[PDB]
Design an enzyme around this catalytic site. Sequence first.
Site, PDB file in Angstrom:
ATOM      1  N   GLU A  35       0.847  -1.193   0.000  1.00 56.45           N
ATOM      2  CA  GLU A  35       0.000   0.000   0.000  1.00 56.45           C
ATOM      3  C   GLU A  35       0.879   1.238   0.000  1.00 56.45           C
ATOM      4  O   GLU A  35       1.639   1.452   0.964  1.00 56.45           O
ATOM      5  CB  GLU A  35      -0.926   0.018   1.218  1.00 56.45           C
ATOM      6  CG  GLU A  35      -1.998  -1.055   1.224  1.00 56.45           C
ATOM      7  CD  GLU A  35      -2.363  -1.516   2.626  1.00 56.45           C
ATOM      8  OE1 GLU A  35      -1.460  -1.943   3.375  1.00 56.45           O
ATOM      9  OE2 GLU A  35      -3.559  -1.462   2.976  1.00 56.45           O
TER      10      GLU A  35
ATOM     11  N   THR B 201      -1.176  -8.682   3.079  1.00 59.90           N
ATOM     12  CA  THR B 201       0.236  -8.321   3.070  1.00 59.90           C
ATOM     13  C   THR B 201       0.963  -8.942   4.253  1.00 59.90           C
ATOM     14  O   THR B 201       2.004  -9.586   4.089  1.00 59.90           O
ATOM     15  CB  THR B 201       0.393  -6.802   3.088  1.00 59.90           C
ATOM     16  OG1 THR B 201      -0.550  -6.210   2.189  1.00 59.90           O
ATOM     17  CG2 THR B 201       1.794  -6.417   2.669  1.00 59.90           C
TER      18      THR B 201
ATOM     19  N   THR C  42     -11.446  -6.788  13.410  1.00 63.23           N
ATOM     20  CA  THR C  42     -11.761  -5.824  12.367  1.00 63.23           C
ATOM     21  C   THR C  42     -11.844  -6.457  10.986  1.00 63.23           C
ATOM     22  O   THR C  42     -11.705  -5.751   9.983  1.00 63.23           O
ATOM     23  CB  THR C  42     -10.718  -4.709  12.357  1.00 63.23           C
ATOM     24  OG1 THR C  42      -9.515  -5.186  11.745  1.00 63.23           O
ATOM     25  CG2 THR C  42     -10.406  -4.283  13.775  1.00 63.23           C
TER      26      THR C  42
ATOM     27  N   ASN D 226       1.144   0.797  19.661  1.00 62.95           N
ATOM     28  CA  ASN D 226       2.478   0.746  19.083  1.00 62.95           C
ATOM     29  C   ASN D 226       3.518   1.331  20.027  1.00 62.95           C
ATOM     30  O   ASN D 226       4.668   0.874  20.053  1.00 62.95           O
ATOM     31  CB  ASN D 226       2.493   1.497  17.766  1.00 62.95           C
ATOM     32  CG  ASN D 226       1.438   0.997  16.807  1.00 62.95           C
ATOM     33  OD1 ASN D 226       1.076  -0.198  16.798  1.00 62.95           O
ATOM     34  ND2 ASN D 226       0.962   1.907  15.947  1.00 62.95           N
TER      35      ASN D 226
ATOM     36  N   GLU E  10      21.643 -16.683  23.424  1.00 61.06           N
ATOM     37  CA  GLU E  10      21.393 -17.079  24.806  1.00 61.06           C
ATOM     38  C   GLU E  10      19.910 -17.072  25.125  1.00 61.06           C
ATOM     39  O   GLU E  10      19.459 -17.797  26.017  1.00 61.06           O
ATOM     40  CB  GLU E  10      22.124 -16.143  25.769  1.00 61.06           C
ATOM     41  CG  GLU E  10      23.600 -16.425  25.934  1.00 61.06           C
ATOM     42  CD  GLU E  10      24.132 -15.963  27.275  1.00 61.06           C
ATOM     43  OE1 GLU E  10      23.595 -14.979  27.821  1.00 61.06           O
ATOM     44  OE2 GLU E  10      25.087 -16.587  27.787  1.00 61.06           O
TER      45      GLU E  10
HETATM   46  N1  LIG Z   1      -0.966  -3.186  17.433  1.00 61.98           N
HETATM   47  C1  LIG Z   1      -1.397  -2.641  16.160  1.00 61.98           C
HETATM   48  N2  LIG Z   1      -2.244  -3.462  15.259  1.00 61.98           N
HETATM   49  C2  LIG Z   1      -2.697  -2.917  13.952  1.00 61.98           C
HETATM   50  C3  LIG Z   1      -2.323  -1.645  13.570  1.00 61.98           C
HETATM   51  N3  LIG Z   1      -2.854  -1.405  12.372  1.00 61.98           N
HETATM   52  C4  LIG Z   1      -3.554  -2.508  11.990  1.00 61.98           C
HETATM   53  N4  LIG Z   1      -3.442  -3.435  12.982  1.00 61.98           N
HETATM   54  C5  LIG Z   1      -4.084  -4.741  12.888  1.00 61.98           C
HETATM   55  O1  LIG Z   1      -3.559  -5.544  11.593  1.00 61.98           O
HETATM   56  C6  LIG Z   1      -4.517  -6.371  11.260  1.00 61.98           C
HETATM   57  C7  LIG Z   1      -4.832  -6.229   9.731  1.00 61.98           C
HETATM   58  O2  LIG Z   1      -3.647  -6.297   9.038  1.00 61.98           O
HETATM   59  P1  LIG Z   1      -3.199  -4.977   8.174  1.00 61.98           P
HETATM   60  O3  LIG Z   1      -1.716  -4.744   8.344  1.00 61.98           O
HETATM   61  O4  LIG Z   1      -3.997  -3.757   8.627  1.00 61.98           O
HETATM   62  O5  LIG Z   1      -3.489  -5.284   6.574  1.00 61.98           O
HETATM   63  P2  LIG Z   1      -2.391  -6.197   5.750  1.00 61.98           P
HETATM   64  O6  LIG Z   1      -1.933  -7.316   6.648  1.00 61.98           O
HETATM   65  O7  LIG Z   1      -1.215  -5.304   5.395  1.00 61.98           O
HETATM   66  O8  LIG Z   1      -3.099  -6.773   4.372  1.00 61.98           O
HETATM   67  P3  LIG Z   1      -3.674  -5.714   3.240  1.00 61.98           P
HETATM   68  O9  LIG Z   1      -4.830  -4.955   3.849  1.00 61.98           O
HETATM   69  O10 LIG Z   1      -4.124  -6.459   2.004  1.00 61.98           O
HETATM   70  O11 LIG Z   1      -2.575  -4.734   2.888  1.00 61.98           O
HETATM   71  C8  LIG Z   1      -5.738  -5.960  12.073  1.00 61.98           C
HETATM   72  O12 LIG Z   1      -5.950  -6.862  13.072  1.00 61.98           O
HETATM   73  C9  LIG Z   1      -5.339  -4.593  12.671  1.00 61.98           C
HETATM   74  O13 LIG Z   1      -6.054  -4.353  13.952  1.00 61.98           O
HETATM   75  C10 LIG Z   1      -1.441  -0.784  14.501  1.00 61.98           C
HETATM   76  O14 LIG Z   1      -1.126   0.312  14.166  1.00 61.98           O
HETATM   77  N5  LIG Z   1      -1.001  -1.307  15.774  1.00 61.98           N
HETATM   78 MG   LIG Z   2      -3.182  -4.203   4.881  1.00 64.01          MG
END
Ligand SMILES: Nc1nc2c(ncn2[C@@H]2O[C@H](COP(=O)(O)OP(=O)(O)OP(=O)(O)O)[C@@H](O)[C@H]2O)c(=O)[nH]1
Ligand SMILES: [Mg+2]
Lengths: 48, 431, 428, 428, 428
Positions: free
Chosen positions: B63, B137, B171, B220, B246
């Site tokens: 993305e 991803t 989500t 985060n 270790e």
């Molecule tokens: N701890 C934390 N979890 C996140 C965050 N952003 C998204 N998530 C979680 O990541 C999960 C979804 O994966 P994403 O990274 O958003 O999407 P992707 O895995 O890149 O796959 P695509 O949407 O096709 O690009 C969900 O459970 C989100 O709640 C963040 O900033 N912090």
């Molecule tokens: Mg994504």
Amino acid sequence: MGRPDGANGPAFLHAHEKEPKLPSPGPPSNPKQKIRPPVPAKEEKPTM
Amino acid sequence: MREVISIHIGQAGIQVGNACWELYCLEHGIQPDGQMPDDAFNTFFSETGAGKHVPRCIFLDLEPTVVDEVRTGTYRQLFHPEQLISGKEDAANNFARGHYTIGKEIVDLALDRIRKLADNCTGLQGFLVFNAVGGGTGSGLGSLLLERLSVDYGKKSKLGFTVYPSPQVSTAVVEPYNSVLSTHSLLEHTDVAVMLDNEAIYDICRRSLDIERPTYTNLNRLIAQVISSLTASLRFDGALNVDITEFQTNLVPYPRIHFMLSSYAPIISAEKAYHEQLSVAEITNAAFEPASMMVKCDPRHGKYMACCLMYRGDVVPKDVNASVATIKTKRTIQFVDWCPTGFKCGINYQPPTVVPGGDLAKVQRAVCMISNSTAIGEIFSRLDHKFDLMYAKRAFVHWYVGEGMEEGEFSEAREDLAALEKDFEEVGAES
Amino acid sequence: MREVISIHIGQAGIQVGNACWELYCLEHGIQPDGQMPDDAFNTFFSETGAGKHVPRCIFLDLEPTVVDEVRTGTYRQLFHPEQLISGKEDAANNFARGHYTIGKEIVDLALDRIRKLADNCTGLQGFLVFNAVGGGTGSGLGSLLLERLSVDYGKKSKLGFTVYPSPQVSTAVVEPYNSVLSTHSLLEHTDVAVMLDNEAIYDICRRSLDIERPTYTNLNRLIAQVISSLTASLRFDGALNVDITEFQTNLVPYPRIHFMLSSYAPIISAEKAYHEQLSVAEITNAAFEPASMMVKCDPRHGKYMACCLMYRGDVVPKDVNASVATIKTKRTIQFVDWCPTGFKCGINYQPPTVVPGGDLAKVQRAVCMISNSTAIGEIFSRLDHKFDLMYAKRAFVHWYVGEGMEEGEFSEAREDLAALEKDFEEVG
Amino acid sequence: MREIVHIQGGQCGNQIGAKFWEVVSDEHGIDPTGTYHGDSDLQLERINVYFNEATGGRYVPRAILMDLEPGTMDSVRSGPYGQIFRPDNFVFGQTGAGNNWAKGHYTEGAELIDSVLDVVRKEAESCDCLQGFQVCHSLGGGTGSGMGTLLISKIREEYPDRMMLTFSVVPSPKVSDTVVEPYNATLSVHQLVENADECMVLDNEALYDICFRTLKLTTPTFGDLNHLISAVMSGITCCLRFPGQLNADLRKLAVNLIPFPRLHFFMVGFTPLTSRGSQQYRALTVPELTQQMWDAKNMMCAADPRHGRYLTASALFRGRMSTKEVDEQMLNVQNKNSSYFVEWIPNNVKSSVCDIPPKGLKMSATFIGNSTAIQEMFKRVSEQFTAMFRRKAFLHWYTGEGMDEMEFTEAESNMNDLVSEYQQYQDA
Amino acid sequence: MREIVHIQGGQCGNQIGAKFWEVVSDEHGIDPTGTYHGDSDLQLERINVYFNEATGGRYVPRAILMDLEPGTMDSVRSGPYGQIFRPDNFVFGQTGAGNNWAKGHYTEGAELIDSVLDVVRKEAESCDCLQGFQVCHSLGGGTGSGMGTLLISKIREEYPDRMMLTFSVVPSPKVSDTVVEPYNATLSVHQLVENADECMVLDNEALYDICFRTLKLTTPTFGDLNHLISAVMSGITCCLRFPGQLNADLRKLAVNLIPFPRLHFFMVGFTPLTSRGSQQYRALTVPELTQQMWDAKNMMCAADPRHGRYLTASALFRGRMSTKEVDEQMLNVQNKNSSYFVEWIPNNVKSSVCDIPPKGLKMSATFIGNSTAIQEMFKRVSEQFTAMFRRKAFLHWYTGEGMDEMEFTEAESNMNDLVSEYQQYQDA
Ligand SMILES: Nc1nc2c(ncn2[C@@H]2O[C@H](COP(=O)(O)OP(=O)(O)OP(=O)(O)O)[C@@H](O)[C@H]2O)c(=O)[nH]1
Ligand SMILES: [Mg+2]
Ligand SMILES: Nc1nc2c(ncn2[C@@H]2O[C@H](COP(=O)(O)OP(=O)(O)OP(=O)(O)O)[C@@H](O)[C@H]2O)c(=O)[nH]1
Ligand SMILES: Nc1nc2c(ncn2[C@@H]2O[C@H](COP(=O)(O)OP(=O)(O)O)[C@@H](O)[C@H]2O)c(=O)[nH]1
Ligand SMILES: Nc1nc2c(ncn2[C@@H]2O[C@H](COP(=O)(O)OP(=O)(O)O)[C@@H](O)[C@H]2O)c(=O)[nH]1
Ligand SMILES: [Mg+2]
């Protein structure tokens, strides 16, 4: 480049012309060959 | 010398990468413009011929909309522009697209960065992977990437800090599937796998930090405080220095069992730190507390097979061995029979650092616990249930098979969980 | 005494002549009006009886429309007006015209220049042929010229920097044919032939230079950076000064295999230097990277018979022998068994010069690699396909047969390519 | 050097030539008095490709206006740019041709060649290096077609080395400009297949769509269509007149275009063409020029290229641009819509560039297509000819000049083979 | 990247297409002149998803207005935002359509497809990487329902991989804006079951009550209903055009929504929606938006959620908010009224979020839900169709255009096969 004129004519649409078909549930090609060995069977008892 | 390579995959991968890399630039006085006013940072950076310190990490995603933010925000002069790898289109929450359609053409561009990144470190401790299991991803590419890392490097240590699908808070609707398919690819390829859920860290934000408006920018900021407490021994002097080798050595009993939980302590606002003393014995009790776990699992349903402990601040070993001695007597805490030992403890004289505008308190003592418990077989079974709940109807399948897959991939990745389930009771033999 | 003769043939021949000769005039403080405000320039110039430093080169072509630009450009007081040879009618992308009809009526003129260009020469290193294979003037005149140079000197060395037709980029349709006809005439006559494709140098300008509107004037500003690096030892002090004969001995195992690849590093924008150190270690890993090749060949499908590395700038040999040693161990790079060695290394203390308005960055370390590999059969078999695909119908033949040629010259020049590709397989 | 002599035959030719010499004159900054009033030294260096110096700084064109019934010449002899021509280059006959190919080729035309040839040679030898001829015909009438071809057969033998071009305007499919049009068409075609190196075809029909669709004009007069044709005739010789980083002489444009000696009919277009309202929205980038030139609308002939295959093609870009964007675009199309390009030719486009755009623009192009849909002009003509030659209608006019009848059938066999040559090579 | 292309076919399409581009043009701070007049750089970052940079820094849409009888286009050609469109992107025919599916799909449609396809591809290449198409319909009419699906059947075959949304306006349940609404519905729905990835359904009835009850409007002009339709159509691309702490592209919305390739008939809503008075009473918190969005009023379609079972759902929030709140809210909904949701899906919602609200607001939302009560509309209409087709009323109009009766029964059975799909998965 497009198509020549008069060849974009509308065609007849049957029922279920565009419908995906499940091939079958079938054993896949490659199991990917796990690298890590399994857990022992809790009864080896090598200690003596 | 003591150098590691950090990776970030998917959105959550780089949305934690913006937290960790906001922490290190701050933990070493690194201005956002690369430069600053040895080996204190050489774990994470590399001087160029002109002043700057560039991080040795990789932001990878499909993305542009999340990578360009880094390219416009204040942290844009930092990264070598080539390391921030992006993609035209995204995976669209589909394990196939991340594994068969799109992921295949960019890995070579990623690997040529890793190779260019390997030579620049003289001694490589191990790779750090920040994954997000549940998307296309994060799961699809993380699958494909972790394999290629095993062929090119083999036995090199790859950690895994992969956010997992939460039971209630979710989500997505298809995140059951792309989670299951990911397991085999992580299991056989990652060396150690820490886990954490977006929900478990919500309640910790509720009770402890008392921020009724929690977002991802808060969570985060917590993981940053974990890894900084974990890699302090890589770049900060301290008694009982503990490295990655270790770490996994005396924590992973079998090649299979490499999943574990995390717990930080203390987690306190800037005002209750005045209603408090935060003794080393108090902190370590709140560390083993189930409510301070970063996963929605229950340790009192299983048994502890091993625990690690990274202390930080004004701490002396006489106090570590004393408080640990109490817990060993505590009956609430079980231990599987075949570990009379069970603690590898680490100390670091460098206390954790606080980010301006952050929510934690400036404290001179902190504890980050990581324990390999067998109770984790719970969070691993809910996925077994929901997956079969939907897969009995072939729902959403035409997407996966419509993108260069077949049906066998489901049954393989399904059984790989079944076999892994019994292992989490096999090791609890007690005979 | 350490001098060479720089020939430019065709359009791309003189198109690179404008980049190379804008470098040496700048690398030695030679103003465009000849004079400057020894042996630092004697490799390329000739001080007259008073002040003036004329170059020793020859611009040869058939269309005046380009050689006259040199006559009106800022470099018009520089050249001897006879060096800028030109014709009346052009080869018209037809190998026959450049070889049989028009070639035969100006070589007698060009050759007289060389004789008057070699008498002042006291010790001649070797000729330097900038050629563009794919056009009538590049392929026809070049072929006819080389044969004339073999029977005159023979003992002198000819180096062939010939742009080769790329797989995708092709500014012509009949360029397969005259590219084939060139082999039978260059092979037996050039001592060593470097290759480079207009397509591979395009992507170099995409990843590294990040220049999105590339043009022929951009690429030529890269080739000049090769020859500058290649002949640094001839004119600049440095550890392990490498002449031409030395360079040629330990690179060409057999009299046939003299088709080699090139590379350069670092190639970076003037701003990403702020994000890197570019150590001797880092550069030599990038010279052997497949994306840094100047030809669309993949060295991972073949094996290396030798390599030659010309470093430049703040570089000491203790780090050369170290970075080379960590490459023989790398698995990806496969060296053919009958050479456990394979590296002739050259160092200079004169860093690469930068031209105002260029795209590269001022650096203190730079590497130019020139490898003889057996993967070169790839780019040489594509031609064997397009030629056999169009020649099946005798397409465009009536142009070649109408200009004092025949049908044998097609099948003859075709077998020579097969005779060559076996040689790139006998070495397995 | 590289001069060009230009012929204008018939009423149409004596009228396209009016705008052509008006367009070229302005481009070289010369007044209707013939005095150079430009600014740069770029106009003068290649001015002698069309003009001649004269006492007083005049520049008189190298054209030859030939016509029966000089009435139409009196128009251009009186127009704004009518004061530039030499009066001895006006050759005319006092009688009429009557839209009759016979007497325009047998009786009356034969009475002027003795004088026309003294004209063409008088200015063919003043050329220190002749490049070729170029004519402008009209395949409907008698003077343009008849005298045009008779002039060619005299030219083809006197100067076989040089090359003759032909911007022949052919009949229109849906409307008949004359009634005896098919007879004059074939009898002229039978002369072009044998006595022409290249020959572009145009149609007044397609010249209306471009003004009705693309230009969105309101009252398109011939004074505007000739401003279209003059834009391609100026677009061909740019490389001859202006420098460019990839020049293309007039000869190297055929050898890259005509595979077999009889398929020398082409199809042209021009780009950019926008309304006076749309010039506010649409941008000027190489991706725009490349799609509009490739479309099936700017083809100035009434033959849809999407009914056949492209044998070869060309493109003459103008304006300082990026030589890479051009090469990747023309490539991107071939492998994009791979059903309209033949397979036994791997890369079938040539690409030229010029440092000098038109007088009032920044980027421009010009297209030349050799498609196997050009056969469709011949079918539609081969039938209208056989519908009336079948009943011997209107023939007493052609036989009244002593013509035979096998000259009609030979004109049909020669055509009905040319319609098959365009089908073996079109495997669909 | 992620470029869209927008189609507006019909009287409804051409009219709601006006208000749509009126909203987006404001959202990115551009004036009807076409120039940008916003404040932040954030506007210009992802403007290229809907527009095309022009000369002098203009931004023109990439819409396609296609409609017979250009009357309604003469209006939008004269509205306030009528200066932004390219005049070339106007396709119109001089004939009426007659509120008849046949001639809009067979006779008159087939005469303009040559132009429309030549129009869509002029910009389907102006995208560096095309995301997908997006259309607007009026299922009752003849232009939007005949040309609409006819164009789709073409779109699906040249660009099958990409995605095509559809904001089709369906017939009303109680009132009938046309007497031949059934035939135009089924014959179009049958086209939408095979050639559509996503298809919202919007009804003019529900738009009135929402404008009557919730908005308390007195005189709801169609200009007001389209300020609603425009609101939701803009609410889908907020992840594309603007950043977001949890972005959600267009593709990951379908994958996450349709379990089976046929059930692509959704149901939309928009929040918040208050009168001018109540703005001062109710707060703007995430629990507010989710209370009104889940309601059975904001459903722009006339299908009641309390009759069927939600297969899936969605929500696109916009504003700097707390992503814990949205997750626990959408969880509570499924928890409390846990009979409206199927059980073989654990969690059946997605929840996007964006850092950027609308230009005038601080927090907004947008809903999309794929219920099983949508089967009701296809039941209400499949009854009216079989009512009059049983006696063959108004059929001499359809059969007069070369149609048949199999093209009717096929349309009906393919709809009845769809109503069963929505019944199995309704386990009450
Ligand atoms: N701890 C934390 N979890 C996140 C965050 N952003 C998204 N998530 C979680 O990541 C999960 C979804 O994966 P994403 O990274 O958003 O999407 P992707 O895995 O890149 O796959 P695509 O949407 O096709 O690009 C969900 O459970 C989100 O709640 C963040 O900033 N912090
Ligand atoms: Mg994504
Ligand atoms: N790297 C580079 N290649 C060029 C340049 N100019 C032309 N070429 C390539 O050279 C090939 C044609 O060679 P030319 O020299 O133009 O033709 P020629 O040898 O003079 O023969 P004639 O055209 O008949 O006069 C084409 O494939 C070009 O891509 C340049 O300036 N730089
Ligand atoms: N582009 C253009 N074509 C013309 C013009 N005038 C005539 N033509 C064509 O010329 C054809 C008739 O040939 P014509 O030149 O009048 O007879 P000729 O004197 O024997 O050559 C007709 O098809 C005309 O359409 C003009 O002014 N502009
Ligand atoms: N939201 C909205 N819907 C409209 C509007 N005008 C017409 N519609 C609907 O358009 C339907 C008729 O189709 P229409 O496009 O007008 O005729 P067509 O050209 O044959 O398709 C009717 O059901 C109208 O209700 C409008 O202005 N706003
Ligand atoms: Mg040339």
